[PDB]
Amino acid sequence: MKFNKEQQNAFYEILHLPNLNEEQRNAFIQSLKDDPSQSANLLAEAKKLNEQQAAFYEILSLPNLNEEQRNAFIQSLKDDPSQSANLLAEAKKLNEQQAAFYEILHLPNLNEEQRNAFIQSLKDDPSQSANLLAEAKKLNEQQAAFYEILHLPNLNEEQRNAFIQSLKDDPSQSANLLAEAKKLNDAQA
């Protein structure tokens, strides 16, 4: 009973699954050699095992996880690998939320009252992290435009004060005003 094209492809794909050690790979290959008619499920299992382990590795790559939380996720994944996907989601979720903390804490152009508002508001409900982070960034970039137009070397005071005043009036036009200031600055080198 040789292999049909389907069993041949299950064989091939199992042979090329990246995160399987040699003992797992050989076990699957010998079980496939003994009873090829299980190929399909032996593939699925070999795929499932392959992705659980991939979850492992992704947990080990998230930059804003400290090693406590990380080893908690790792050990929980060794205790029951079935739930790997749920664990992985939580691993990413917490990571991004902590990423939100980090960035918001280090935004150069927020005065510390706005920052303390963003962080406290992030501690209250972490689920809003993304929505909050953008709010921080957008706010940062807009205040950043002010000091930027303040310190462009080749501007004179009426140019500066027209851009600044126009930025004070309508901050959402920052990207335009800034982009008009820069171009004018290079115009007056």
Author numbering: 33 to 221
What's the publication's text?
Here, we propose a method for generating proteins and protein complexes with complicated shapes using fusions of alpha helices. To design amino acid sequences that can stabilize the alpha helical structure of the fusion sites, we superimposed one or two turns of terminal alpha helices of connecting proteins using a molecular graphics program. Then, the amino acid residues important for forming a fused helical structure were chosen from the two natural sequences in the superimposed region. Our method does not require complicated computer calculations for the design process and can be used for the assembly of artificial protein complexes with predictable and rigid structures.
